[PDB]
Design a protein around this ligand. Structure first.
Ligand SMILES: Nc1ncnc2c1ncn2[C@@H]1O[C@H](COP(=O)(O)OP(=O)(O)O)[C@@H](O)[C@H]1O
Lengths: 761, 69, 108, 68
């Protein structure tokens, strides 16, 4: 209701302000441009108000020219400054205060003086004119009661225009009225998860009623909503209400769980908003109610859709915070909020993200930069001294203090004026980096991780995995190529990101590789849901991960809360056959539905299954000859041979759905040397506060490497060896009253044991 | 049919403009706006009546195409 | 000046103006967070949540302290810190309805 | 004051918590005679965690005992 209320005089003011900016060479129309164009229309009520104040056009021209400011400008996209749009909101709000359905020049001047920060605000202040003085100056110059007792009308509020414009629900507003204009099942029920904005549908429909967009069949109907919290005595109230509604004939009820005959007789057109689970439990079983309701699904708007919604509200927020918001800031905000926050859906979570981002930059750039605080202290201390001098009858001394204090106050105004003039010079735009800061605090993820552009990260995935995993480069190359194909779009979007099977010796790096992949891709090491088939052996185990069946009291809950995670299925070779049926569905369909009807997603997950089969086949190749192995064969050749064993125990249909098969090699003496090298670096950073560097000789590293050397158990004993050897001695040094403080400790095997050379850094 | 829409909008803005004149005691312009609004409503009635009159000229009937959608 | 709110509710910004009570020290993040929330446009009404005994009531003193220090921005300027007392609260709802009329009109 | 509040011995308060761990082996064998392997293993584990080698969030002690 903006264009429909601005009078012709008000419209000419905006046109005048546009050409004022052209003359002054400004690429953005500021508040001062409104004042210049205002004086060029001496016919409105505002012109009379300033006339009684003896304020002429030329006097304010030079007044604003004192601090007008000049600079370069770019033709095109001549928008309004963030403060200018706040003036329009203020002026329109003041119109409703006086109960006026139109906005004219008399309100433009009223709102200009209420800005209190703009250029025009200071001009009026310099002429001893405030909001109160001009407020009174223009004043002189100028039914179903029982239903309404426990309900609330909506279209009346929408008439006021205070409601924000609901966008993106056009496909559903038309859908609801489509259901209403039917002889049967003319009672639509909105079905969806709570908080997705189901209540916002009613506001959108009421807005269309006020805007005269619904057809005549849906014209002039009172939109009414009843709160669930308003409830023998209860039964008496509803009977009186329904009779009144039948008499009115145009009251649309809105509910959210007696009344069954009312709907059976076509007396009510209620629009429920209950959840899907309650709908299937309390309504589906009732055949009579089922024939009188048409469920309508309410879904979260898409990412691209949210961009348009935020752009519509962008102007409204630019006024409240007086902060310029760029287009690129909005698109980054919605994408990142959806990427990490997965608890409130769009757009109700992206709106608050940009709300805090604007407020955060507002506070930082508003406080005085220690330029007026210093002067304020100087003024304060002189005043207290002068007051004490009066009690001491030091009239001569107080005279000097008066001059000093007056000078301090004189400079205080000068510093404040120049500080705010510089502030008005630039635009306090919002950058996507500021948004990244707020979300980084919400999750603890490092700002560097969030700031990654996701492009070079995928290209350098091979190097990143080698940082935390040493050896078995063939596995790294295959998985890195697989994931980069899926993200490039070569795979079906509904299918998960990847599916893999891990084989080889147990405890060789199968678990560590999965942790490394989760950290590199999803930016978190603990972003993994480890699932073991130890508890899944019987047929009833399938009723555990999918959730308790109806009439009774897991995996779906966890994945839903963390849509970006790596799922591990250990002991897949030992599991109930019915569980395998679920797995095949996930790989192809890409989503599952629990007993409650809610659908989880798997398009942002990587599935990895660990199987113990084939490992004995690999070690048979190692023991085929006394002193020989088959490591020199081609990697694909080994993959083909191991595939024969894999299909022997599993179903070939399941294997064809798997993206790739990964087989891990063994470990050699030289490889184990580098394994301890990583752990030494990790432990060095562990006690980073002490700043102690530990260097271990090659002989000592080899001595401890062979101590834990066990091909049957892999590299598992290696970690325990370091714990009982280096950690035990190092800890005792610290326990002895900080024996080493920022020093350097070298460990060298002298032949008998590890010689702990104690020295300094 | 995209005709009574804009015509109704003009009636709305004219009514607001007349209200501004009344509150500003600009009765000279208000008198002109009052006559202008009557002109808008006079053609509004004729435009609406001819539209619904032509609506009865044709009969809207279903087809398998509509059900297919 | 909301005369009814002054009687049925306790006013704390006056006490902070006099500075009789000890200043709140150590709650730097809590105070900076509350002012940030109040500067927002939507859901700008923070609620203090904590265990009973961490002195959440004393935390509200720090917010009024910044007003007396004139450290809060212009948006928070001229806002009286009024706290409702449960001792004063059909007849129960008469008092709250009477006070809320003045609060909405004042707007500060 | 604290000693008279919960009955904590004054000697324990005077301890700097730097030599109690050093004498943990002697104290444990005072009440548990024998089974030296079960005593030395846990004595050398608490020092590592308290020094800061282990993750601070995770609990210092986590063991499972076997036997009658
Ligand atoms: N960078 C690395 N390269 C190779 N192996 C590693 C690396 N880091 C850790 N490991 C090994 O990976 C093993 C993971 O064991 P895990 O797979 O959990 O055993 P299991 O398969 O029995 O569950 C650890 O014992 C560790 O020795």
């Amino acid at each position: 209701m903006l264009f429909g209320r601005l009078t012709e005089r008000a419209q000419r003011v905006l046109a005048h302000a546009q050409e004022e900016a052209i003359r002054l060479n400004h690429s953005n129309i500021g508040t001062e441009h409104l004042l210049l164009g205002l004086m060029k229309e001496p016919e409105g009520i505002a012109a009379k108000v300033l006339e009684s104040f003896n304020i002429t056009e030329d006097k304010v021209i030079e007044e604003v020219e004192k601090l007008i400011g000049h600079g370069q400008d770019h033709v095109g996209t001549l928008h309004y400054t963030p403060r200018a749009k706040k003036v329009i909101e203020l002026s329109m709000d003041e119109a409703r205060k006086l109960h006026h359905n139109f906005v004219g020049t008399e309100h433009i001047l009223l709102g200009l003086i209420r800005e209190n920060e703009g250029v025009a605000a200071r001009v009026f202040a310099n002429l001893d004119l405030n909001i109160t003085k001009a407020r009174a100056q223009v004043v002189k110059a100028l039914n179903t009661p029982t239903l309404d007792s426990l309900a609330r009308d909506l279209t009346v509020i929408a008439k006021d225009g205070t409601l924000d414009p609901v966008i993106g629900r056009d496909k559903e507003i038309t859908r609801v009225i489509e259901v209403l204009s039917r002889r049967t099942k003319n009672n639509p029920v909105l079905i969806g998860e709570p908080g997705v904005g189901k209540t916002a549908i009613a506001e959108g429909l009421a807005q269309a009623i006020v805007n005269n967009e619904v057809p005549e069949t849906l014209k002039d109907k009172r939109v009414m909503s009843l709160d669930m919290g308003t409830v023998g005595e209860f039964e008496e109230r509803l009977k009186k209400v329904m009779e009144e509604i039948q008499q009115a004939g145009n009251v649309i009820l809105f509910i959210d769980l007696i009344l069954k005959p009312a709907l059976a007789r076509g007396e009510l057109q209620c629009i429920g908003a209950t959840t899907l689970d309650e709908y299937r439990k309390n309504i589906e079983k009732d055949a009579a109610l089922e024939r009188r309701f048409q469920p309508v699904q309410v879904d979260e708007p898409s990412v691209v859709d949210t961009v348009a919604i935020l752009k519509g509200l962008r102007d409204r927020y630019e006024a409240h915070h007086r902060i310029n918001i760029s287009d690129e800031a909005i698109e980054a905000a919605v994408k990142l909020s959806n990427r990490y926050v997965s608890d409130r859906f769009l757009p109700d979570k992206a709106i608050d993200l940009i709300d805090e981002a604007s407020s955060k930059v507002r506070l930082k750039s508003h406080t005085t930069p220690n330029n007026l605080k210093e002067i304020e202290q100087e003024i304060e201390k002189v005043k207290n001294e002068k007051d004490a001098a009066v009690h001491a009858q030091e009239f001569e001394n107080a005279a000097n203090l008066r001059d000093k204090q007056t000078k301090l106050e004189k400079q205080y105004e000068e510093a404040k004026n120049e500080w705010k003039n510089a502030q008005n010079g630039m635009s306090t735009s919002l950058s996507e980096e500021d948004i990244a800061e707020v979300i980084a605090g919400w999750t603890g993820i490092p700002l560097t991780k969030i700031n990654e552009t996701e492009s070079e990260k995928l290209l350098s995935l091979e190097d990143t995995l080698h940082e935390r995993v040493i050896g078995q480069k063939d596995a790294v190359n295959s998985i890195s190529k697989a994931v980069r194909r899926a993200r490039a779009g070569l795979k079906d979007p509904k299918r998960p990101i990847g599916s893999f099977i891990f084989l080889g010796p147990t405890g060789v790096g199968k678990t560590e590789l999965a942790r490394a992949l989760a950290e590199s891709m999803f930016g978190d090491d603990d972003a993994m849901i480890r699932v073991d088939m130890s508890e899944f052996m019987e047929k009833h185990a399938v009723s555990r991960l999918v959730g308790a069946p109806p009439g009774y009291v897991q995996l779906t809950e966890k994945v839903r809360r963390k849509p970006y995670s790596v799922i591990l299925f250990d002991e897949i070779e030992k599991a109930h056959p019915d569980v395998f049926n679920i797995l095949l569905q996930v790989l192809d369909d890409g989503h599952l539905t629990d007993t409650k009807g809610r659908t989880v997603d798997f398009r942002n997950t990587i599935i990895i299954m660990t199987s113990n089969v084939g490992a004995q086949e690999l070690q048979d190749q190692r023991f085929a000859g006394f002193g020989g192995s088959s490591d020199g064969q081609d990697y694909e050749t080994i993959r083909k041979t191991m595939l024969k064993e894999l299909k022997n125990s599993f179903r070939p249909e399941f294997l064809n759905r798997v993206d790739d098969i990964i087989v891990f090699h063994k470990l050699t003496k030289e490889e184990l040397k580098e394994i301890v090298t990583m752990m030494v670096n990790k432990l060095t950073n562990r006690l980073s506060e002490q700043n102690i560097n530990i260097i271990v000789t090659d002989k000592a590293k080899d001595k401890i490497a062979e101590e834990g050397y066990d091909p049957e158990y892999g590299a598992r004993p290696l970690i325990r060896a370091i714990q009982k050897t280096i950690e035990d001695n190092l800890s005792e040094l610290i326990l002895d009253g900080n024996q080493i403080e920022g020093k350097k400790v070298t460990v060298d095997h002298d032949g008998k044991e590890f010689k702990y050379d104690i020295a300094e850094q």
